[PDB]
Design an enzyme around this catalytic site. Structure first.
Site, short mmCIF file in Angstrom:
data_model
loop_
_atom_site.label_atom_id
_atom_site.label_comp_id
_atom_site.label_asym_id
_atom_site.label_seq_id
_atom_site.Cartn_x
_atom_site.Cartn_y
_atom_site.Cartn_z
N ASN A 30 60.87 15.33 -48.35
CA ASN A 30 59.50 15.67 -47.99
C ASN A 30 59.02 14.60 -47.03
OD1 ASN A 30 59.11 13.63 -50.11
ND2 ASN A 30 56.97 14.26 -50.19
N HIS A 41 59.90 13.09 -37.23
CA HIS A 41 60.87 12.99 -38.31
C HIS A 41 61.53 11.64 -38.36
CE1 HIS A 41 60.52 17.26 -39.40
NE2 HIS A 41 60.01 17.29 -38.17
#
EC number: 3.2.2.29
Length: 193
Positions: A30, A41
Site C-alpha cells: 500500500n 511510487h
DNA sequence: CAGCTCTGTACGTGAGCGATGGACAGCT
DNA sequence: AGCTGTCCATCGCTCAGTACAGAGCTG
C-alpha cells in the site's frame, strides 16, 4: 513532511501506472507516507526498489520515483498496490482491507494482463494466494509461483518487500537476486514470444 | 499428543534528522 | 588578540516486513 501533517497524507492515495501489453506490474503492499506525499511510487529514501531496479539491469541508469510514469513505455513496467489506502506501515491494514484489495487487484490484472504480476512483498502474496487460488502455502517461497492469474497467461512472481523495514534482507544488495531472476524470467518470456 | 491458526516480538542496514562543537572569518 | 556569529562535519538517533516461538484451539 515540509509542513504537511501526517493526518493529511493518510487521506491521500497514489495513482496506479497501468497500460496494456506490459511485461511487468510491480504490486506494492500500500502507499507509505512519502509515496502519498509525492504522488510517485517508492520515493522512500531508504526503500530499495529504484536501487534494485538499476543494480539488476532492469533500468540501464539509476532512476528514481519521479521517473515512474516513463516506466511503461520505456521499460515495460507498471505499478499498483494490493491496498489503495495510505498508512505508515503494513501492520496498520486489516485482513478485510487486504482481501478487499486482492479482489480489486485480481480484476486489474485480468484487465491489463501483464506478462508477470510482481508481488513486492511476501505477506501480500500469502493473502493473494489464499484468496484467489484457495491455496494456503505451507512453505511459501520467493520467485515464480505455480498459479497463473485466473483466465490469463499472467505469471505470479514474489520478492521480499523493497521496504528497508525488513531485517532478513537488510540491504538492496540482499534483494537484487530476485530482480535479476525477474529480468531473466522476462527475457525468457519475450524470447519464447 | 500433533497439527493448525493467530498474535506478539525481535531483528540488520543505511538514509536523513536535529544537536553539538570545531574551524574560520569579520570586525574591533 | 578577543570576541561573535555562520557553516559544516560528525554524532547519535529514528525508522522504513518477515520469520518464528508459543499460546489457544481442534482433529
Amino acid at each position: 513532511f515540509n509542513g504537511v501533517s501526517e493526518a493529511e497524507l493518510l487521506t491521500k492515495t497514489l495513482p496506479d501506472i497501468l497500460t496494456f501489453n506490459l511485461d511487468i506490474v510491480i504490486i506494492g503492499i500500500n502507499p507509505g507516507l512519502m509515496a502519498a506525499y509525492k504522488g510517485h511510487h517508492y520515493p522512500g529514501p531508504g526503500n530499495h526498489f529504484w536501487k534494485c531496479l538499476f543494480m539488476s539491469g532492469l533500468s540501464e541508469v539509476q532512476l528514481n520515483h519521479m521517473d515512474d510514469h516513463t516506466l511503461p513505455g520505456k521499460y515495460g513496467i507498471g505499478f499498483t498496490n494490493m491496498v489503495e489506502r495510505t498508512t505508515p506501515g503494513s501492520k496498520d491494514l486489516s485482513s478485510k482491507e487486504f482481501r478487499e484489495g486482492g479482489r480489486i487487484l485480481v480484476q486489474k490484472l485480468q484487465k491489463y494482463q501483464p506478462r508477470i504480476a510482481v508481488f513486492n512483498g511476501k505477506c501480500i502474496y500469502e493473502i493473494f494466494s489464499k484468496e484467489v487460488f484457495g491455496v494456503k502455502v505451507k512453505n511459501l517461497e520467493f520467485g515464480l509461483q505455480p498459479h497463473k492469474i485466473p483466465d490469463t497467461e499472467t505469471l505470479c512472481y514474489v520478492m521480499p518487500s523493497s521496504s528497508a523495514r525488513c531485517a532478513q534482507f537488510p540491504r538492496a544488495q540482499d534483494k537484487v537476486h530476485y530482480y535479476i531472476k525477474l529480468k531473466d524470467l522476462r527475457d525468457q518470456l519475450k524470447g519464447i514470444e
